[PDB]
Amino acid sequence: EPTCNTPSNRACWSDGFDINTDYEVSTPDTGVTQSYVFNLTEVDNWMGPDGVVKEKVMLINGNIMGPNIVANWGDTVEVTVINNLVTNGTSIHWHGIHQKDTNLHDGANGVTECPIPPKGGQRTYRWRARQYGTSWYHSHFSAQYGNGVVGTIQINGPASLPYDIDLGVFPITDYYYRAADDLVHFTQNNAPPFSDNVLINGTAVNPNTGEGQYANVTLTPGKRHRLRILNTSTENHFQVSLVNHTMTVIAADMVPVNAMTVDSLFLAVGQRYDVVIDASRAPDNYWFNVTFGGQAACGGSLNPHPAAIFHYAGAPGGLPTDEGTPPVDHQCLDTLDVRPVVPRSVPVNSFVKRPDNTLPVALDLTGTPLFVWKVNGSDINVDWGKPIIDYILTGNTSYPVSDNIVQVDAVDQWTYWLIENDPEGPFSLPHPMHLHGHDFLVLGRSPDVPAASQQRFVFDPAVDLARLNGDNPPRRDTTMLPAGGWLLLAFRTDNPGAWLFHCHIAWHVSGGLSVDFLERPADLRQRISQEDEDDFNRVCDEWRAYWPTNPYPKIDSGL
Amino acid sequence: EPTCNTPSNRACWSDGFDINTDYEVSTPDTGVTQSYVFNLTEVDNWMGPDGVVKEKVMLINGNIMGPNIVANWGDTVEVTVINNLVTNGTSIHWHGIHQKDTNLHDGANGVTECPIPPKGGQRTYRWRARQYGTSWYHSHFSAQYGNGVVGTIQINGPASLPYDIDLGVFPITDYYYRAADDLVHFTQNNAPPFSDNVLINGTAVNPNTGEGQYANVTLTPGKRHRLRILNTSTENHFQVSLVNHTMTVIAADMVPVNAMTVDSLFLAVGQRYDVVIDASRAPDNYWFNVTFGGQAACGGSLNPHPAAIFHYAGAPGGLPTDEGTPPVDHQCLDTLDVRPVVPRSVPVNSFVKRPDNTLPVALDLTGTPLFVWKVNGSDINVDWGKPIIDYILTGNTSYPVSDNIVQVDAVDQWTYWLIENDPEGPFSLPHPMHLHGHDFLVLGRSPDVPAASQQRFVFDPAVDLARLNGDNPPRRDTTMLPAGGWLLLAFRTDNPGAWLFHCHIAWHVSGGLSVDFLERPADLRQRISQEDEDDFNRVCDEWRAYWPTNPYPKIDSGL
Ligand SMILES: *[C@@H]1O[C@H](CO)[C@@H](O[C@@H]2O[C@H](CO)[C@@H](O[C@@H]3O[C@H](CO[C@H]4O[C@H](CO)[C@@H](O)[C@H](O)[C@@H]4O)[C@@H](O)[C@H](O)[C@@H]3O)[C@H](O)[C@H]2NC(C)=O)[C@H](O)[C@H]1NC(C)=O
Ligand SMILES: *[C@@H]1O[C@H](CO)[C@@H](O[C@@H]2O[C@H](CO)[C@@H](O[C@@H]3O[C@H](CO[C@H]4O[C@H](CO)[C@@H](O)[C@H](O)[C@@H]4O)[C@@H](O)[C@H](O)[C@@H]3O)[C@H](O)[C@H]2NC(C)=O)[C@H](O)[C@H]1NC(C)=O
Ligand SMILES: *[C@@H]1O[C@H](CO)[C@@H](O[C@@H]2O[C@H](CO)[C@@H](O[C@@H]3O[C@H](CO)[C@@H](O)[C@H](O)[C@@H]3O)[C@H](O)[C@H]2NC(C)=O)[C@H](O)[C@H]1NC(C)=O
Ligand SMILES: *[C@@H]1O[C@H](CO)[C@@H](O[C@@H]2O[C@H](CO)[C@@H](O[C@@H]3O[C@H](CO)[C@@H](O)[C@H](O)[C@@H]3O)[C@H](O)[C@H]2NC(C)=O)[C@H](O)[C@H]1NC(C)=O
Ligand SMILES: *[C@@H]1O[C@H](CO)[C@@H](O[C@@H]2O[C@H](CO)[C@@H](O)[C@H](O)[C@H]2NC(C)=O)[C@H](O)[C@H]1NC(C)=O
Ligand SMILES: *[C@@H]1O[C@H](CO)[C@@H](O[C@@H]2O[C@H](CO)[C@@H](O)[C@H](O)[C@H]2NC(C)=O)[C@H](O)[C@H]1NC(C)=O
Ligand SMILES: *[C@@H]1O[C@H](CO)[C@@H](O[C@@H]2O[C@H](CO)[C@@H](O)[C@H](O)[C@H]2NC(C)=O)[C@H](O)[C@H]1NC(C)=O
Ligand SMILES: *[C@@H]1O[C@H](CO)[C@@H](O[C@@H]2O[C@H](CO)[C@@H](O)[C@H](O)[C@H]2NC(C)=O)[C@H](O)[C@H]1NC(C)=O
Ligand SMILES: *[C@@H]1O[C@H](CO)[C@@H](O[C@@H]2O[C@H](CO)[C@@H](O)[C@H](O)[C@H]2NC(C)=O)[C@H](O)[C@H]1NC(C)=O
Ligand SMILES: *[C@@H]1O[C@H](CO)[C@@H](O)[C@H](O)[C@H]1NC(C)=O
Ligand SMILES: *[C@@H]1O[C@H](CO)[C@@H](O)[C@H](O)[C@H]1NC(C)=O
Ligand SMILES: *[C@@H]1O[C@H](CO)[C@@H](O)[C@H](O)[C@H]1NC(C)=O
Ligand SMILES: *[C@@H]1O[C@H](CO)[C@@H](O)[C@H](O)[C@H]1NC(C)=O
Ligand SMILES: *[C@@H]1O[C@H](CO)[C@@H](O)[C@H](O)[C@H]1NC(C)=O
Ligand SMILES: COc1cccc(OC)c1O
Ligand SMILES: COc1cccc(OC)c1O
Ligand SMILES: [Cl-]
Ligand SMILES: [Cl-]
Ligand SMILES: [Cu+2]
Ligand SMILES: [Cu+2]
Ligand SMILES: [Cu+2]
Ligand SMILES: [Cu+2]
Ligand SMILES: [Cu+2]
Ligand SMILES: [Cu+2]
Ligand SMILES: [Cu+2]
Ligand SMILES: [Cu+2]
């Protein structure tokens, strides 16, 4: 609970805690728990928000999205998940939530847990809210989140600008009429489809029939409004803009940044931006437009103009009349101009590229099926029935090759990772890379070029070392690997655990595009509570009993 | 020579000849021949128009393009080509010129002729100008035209709109620093590059250094100007627009059409439009913009804003100040709205899909190299040393499989062709399909959707018969095969000969994307003159003597 957080002083939170606190090492002791139940059900012939009826969806508490999780900085969030699906296991991942010393609550099935079995299986997740901002949660059972197992998280806390009104969460997502497993199967041997529509805060209008509704945000004139934008898609990467207005960024993913005003923003899959919008224009109805850049390299939609309505309180109703002008083409790249309020500093002059710090991503067209993604020569394939945590708890170091384990033994040290985007393959795509358990620093990437250009770069020390930034670089949980190029990341090994690092395009991670950082495994085993161990074993026993009875095979990586 | 073609009556030509004459069956007997010599040379370290030096080019008469051929309707055009290259053969194709009963002057090496040998080989082409309009010529020796063996043709004649000034030819082309054989090799195993620049009437500014010059077209205030726009690219498909001005289309390819006013136009590779621009606006400098649509499915350039300057005479110099608005995205599709002045009508209700009228295009990824294009199961591969005409002249009917012979014995009948774009393959691309020896009627295509959306269509007669048009449809020599769809064409078998029908993207035809329509072969042999037969045998004899001495292999289809 805050004691000095006001519109004119959003920097302030409580005694000892403000915007400048190092929230990665200091957390309020509130002693409060916010708890929730997620009852997952399987619904056939479900009428969606654009008038179209979908074959099958998978819903939490019967709605298009799960509960909006809301708690304060330092609270505990607790969620009992009850799996009432017909065949699928399930696992809920808290995306953005670092799970400091609570790896077994990460929700990564095959890594930190077995799937919760269907027909009534249950598990209670429990995690400390040690970071304030906007995050989201979703199934990690193959591509199940594409069926509806998805929701948002708002952990209140201080901010880097003053503002009057918190408008709350604003999820934007691709929307397909075809069910997730059908799309996985299709994307194994075909290039991915455009989306059927793009939902903004759960609604859109049908581009063909005119059924459905525009999302409608009411602005209070003369007021500063915080809007928490999310990209909860399975594949589409979005550019957003508000006709006749600017947006001032105050956080990126779950990291507060210094105020940065822009005309439009790129959101990769899984990215978030908290913005402040001043209602200082003529009182009217204004379009909020979703657009695509990068020449379809990171998605498109069969709805030519997805949009919502920003309405000035006290103005006429009806539709905006100004279509406005197209935003700048972001070429499927997030901005590296953001600067966190709480700084970090690392050296970059000393980096040397070596097999043990290099992650080559490659598309393999030679095997079955056609599209298999490999990192360091291997497509990930987890075993839902023998998670990496099982090996840790039984002292088994014989990890299978397909688990893509990258063991990182350094204790609380900065580690450096060069990810290479198939520079020598016939074709290369942008990928939204996401790290569990940590925010990373984005130290540099290959020069910014048009996404579909097929321009290729290999890291050259004689030109690229000088292009890296170790002085308070963008710090967050998801960033873009450039088509045909490279990305250099760093994170500190402060959190023992098995942590996935993976492309967040569902079809890609389904296709193998992941590794698993095994951070400080010796330290990890010592830190697992008897409570966490017993319950991990309980779920695994139930999953292992269930699986032989399942009528469908596993046909992808499991993630 | 005309007698009644003036600015207010452009419809008039001479006694018996006007815009409504059927130029396909009636031609002025002028008795005049216009002759040219084309001297081909190989130039290394050539300084091109944007300031960059190219490794190697191949030039006609030492310039970036060959001579502008110009003659009157009914004239004879005669060109002596002297091949002074070091190693390559050559053969010049007159694109848009139907070669009525002159198949052996078509310039299709491996089909109508052996290539002209280097180190001084020569051949004289002679053909009748039985069509008036704007066409072009280029080498057909693999992708050699990508090195500079290219130029324009203007055959003067009547028009469908009055105009005051003929501005003449305005060729727009992609421009690569790499040589054609290097691009062919590259494209065999890799997605194709964006162009380095886009030249407009032989010039452009380097977007990095600012070296070079904009094309500068001077307009006469208050006058109507005919502009003859061509796309002479190897891969790039262009949208063109002129800030604050419309363009009135008066011909498409070499076929006069009823006036059609538009804001912007799409030109496929090989396509031409004659347009009339009225200098009716305020005197100033206006940008003529080249842009890309279809989300890169049909090209892009690394020059972000290729452009020319249209200057009103007596206005200030310098650069245009108004950037304008982007045109509508043409999604890599030419317009089907144009209507020829001289009409054709064919039945569409009787069309039945069968194997013998269907041409399935497919990318085969299983062989070597990676990107191989097949039509009806086979990638074309011609024998420069034994052209199809050789089989004809010796009465040998055992045509190799690789020659992709589609024999068509019908005498002067409409024939229907359904072209299918790999609807079952993992991804599909738009293709600019070009027919030698005829203009075709465009009877229909799959529904217009976004070029990069990977939506797929298979001809369904219950839905698609109704979408066909045989009431004076578009008639021309090049049109777009939609990404993932289909195209229905028709031509009348009025021209005995061996006629290529191919994608005009150099990299694809290199890769196998062609067939060879062997039209009425019995009639073909009787109409070949003793001079044509003798000279064919002369050039083949010299080519066959030369080839064993070539230090380089043929690495592609020959086309
Ligand atoms: C989790 O639960 C999911 C929901 O039941 C499971 O997905 C189902 O998985 C099976 C087996 O992979 C699929 O069954 C196949 O369906 C395909 C394709 O059907 C498509 O096309 C037909 C028309 O031909 C149309 O009827 C459908 O709408 C589809 O678009 C068949 O060709 C196969 O032979 C086979 O029957 C189901 O389609 C699929 N359902 C959905 C809605 O995705 C999934 O397996 C479960 N996962 C686990 C690990 O338990
Ligand atoms: C028609 O004439 C053309 C011009 O002479 C011929 O093209 C040449 O063909 C040869 C034989 O294949 C090529 O030689 C190969 O070159 C490649 C690539 O070298 C280039 O690129 C690399 C790297 O980007 C660069 O380092 C070089 O400096 C080159 O620019 C090499 O890998 C091989 O070692 C081999 O030498 C020529 O490069 C190619 N030249 C050009 C300018 O296109 C063509 O073969 C002739 N065709 C016929 C049928 O006679
Ligand atoms: C922001 O979103 C809005 C709403 O989706 C977009 O407005 C839409 O703009 C398009 C493009 O101009 C309009 O479609 C066109 O309309 C004309 C006239 O009917 C027609 O000739 C074209 O064929 C085309 O269909 C559309 O009416 C309009 N929608 C509404 C409800 O007003 C807007 O373009 C988006 N802005 C940006 C910058 O992305
Ligand atoms: C038609 O072609 C002209 C000429 O290429 C285009 O004009 C150019 O427009 C671009 C985009 O606005 C300008 O680039 C911008 O420059 C400013 C600095 O002044 C900078 O803020 C941006 O980062 C961007 O690079 C460019 O200056 C301008 N060129 C000239 C010589 O005026 C025009 O955009 C094209 N119009 C259409 C409809 O395609
Ligand atoms: C967006 O929501 C607002 C708020 O509910 C709607 O605004 C009202 O519009 C009606 C007429 O349609 C007026 O009579 C009210 O005075 C408005 N309220 C306020 C507070 O300004 C608006 O209609 C909605 N827009 C759409 C497209 O439905
Ligand atoms: C990527 O795979 C390569 C090949 O297995 C790994 O390279 C080895 O790294 C270990 C640890 O440094 C060394 O002992 C070996 O000498 C390396 N083998 C070879 C032949 O290079 C590499 O470590 C893997 N990288 C990552 C990030 O997981
Ligand atoms: C295309 O560019 C050529 C550049 O040569 C232009 O042709 C010249 O233009 C001037 C002025 O109109 C003529 O008087 C010269 O005699 C021409 N030279 C040659 C060799 O043809 C031409 O004008 C350009 N076309 C347009 C529309 O600007
Ligand atoms: C395009 O060409 C025209 C020539 O037709 C140039 O227009 C002249 O501009 C100069 C000033 O630079 C004037 O003194 C002349 O009087 C103009 N002549 C006419 C006939 O209008 C124009 O400068 C050229 N544009 C560019 C970019 O070079
Ligand atoms: C494409 O290839 C197939 C051969 O697989 C051709 O189909 C044959 O055509 C003849 C008629 O000319 C029929 O008698 C045979 O029954 C067909 N065979 C099959 C398997 O259907 C087809 O003609 C070819 N099409 C074109 C336009 O070349
Ligand atoms: C889950 O939701 C369904 C659908 O409303 C309901 O019938 C069921 O009893 C719920 N189960 C539990 C244990 O929450
Ligand atoms: C999002 O939609 C919900 C309805 O579920 C509404 O309560 C909320 O105000 C919306 N938020 C915005 C910013 O429009
Ligand atoms: C490691 O795990 C595998 C799979 O369960 C098992 O076969 C092997 O016996 C285990 N080894 C140890 C040391 O427990
Ligand atoms: C062609 O051009 C070259 C160089 O310009 C010249 O040496 C040669 O004599 C010319 N050859 C002929 C036959 O025209
Ligand atoms: C007919 O052509 C084929 C293909 O070149 C050839 O192998 C065969 O020898 C020819 N036969 C005659 C009689 O020339
Ligand atoms: C834009 O997205 C894509 C385009 C082409 C191929 C892909 O994966 C095989 C893919 O994911
Ligand atoms: C958009 O252009 C292309 C992309 C990928 C492969 C191609 O050749 C097979 C190609 O021509
Ligand atoms: Cl996370
Ligand atoms: Cl032709
Ligand atoms: Cu996530
Ligand atoms: Cu995550
Ligand atoms: Cu990816
Ligand atoms: Cu994950
Ligand atoms: Cu051509
Ligand atoms: Cu041609
Ligand atoms: Cu093609
Ligand atoms: Cu051709």
Swiss-Prot record, chains A, B:
Transmembrane intervals: none
Cysteines engaged in disulfide bonds, as pairs: 4-12, 114-540, 298-332
Record flagged with keyword Glycoprotein: yes
Keywords: Copper, Disulfide bond, Glycoprotein, Lignin degradation, Metal-binding, Oxidoreductase, Signal
Positions annotated to bind Cu cation 1: 93, 434
Catalysed reactions listed for this entry: 4 hydroquinone + O2 = 4 benzosemiquinone + 2 H2O
Positions contributing to Cu cation 4 binding: 431, 503, 508
List of residues binding Cu cation 2: 95, 138, 504
Pfam families assigned to the protein according to its UniProt record, in alphabetical order: Cu-oxidase, Cu-oxidase_2, Cu-oxidase_3
A cellular component annotation (GO) from this entry: extraorganismal space
InterPro entries per record: Cu-oxidase-like_N, Cu-oxidase_2nd, Cu-oxidase_C, Cu-oxidase_fam, Cu_oxidase_CS, Cu_oxidase_Cu_BS, Cupredoxin
Function: Lignin degradation and detoxification of lignin-derived products.
Family: Belongs to the multicopper oxidase family.
Name listed for the protein in its UniProt record: Laccase-1
Organism from which the protein derives: Melanocarpus albomyces
Lineage, opening ranks: Eukaryota, Fungi, Dikarya, Ascomycota, Pezizomycotina
Gene name tied to this protein: LAC1
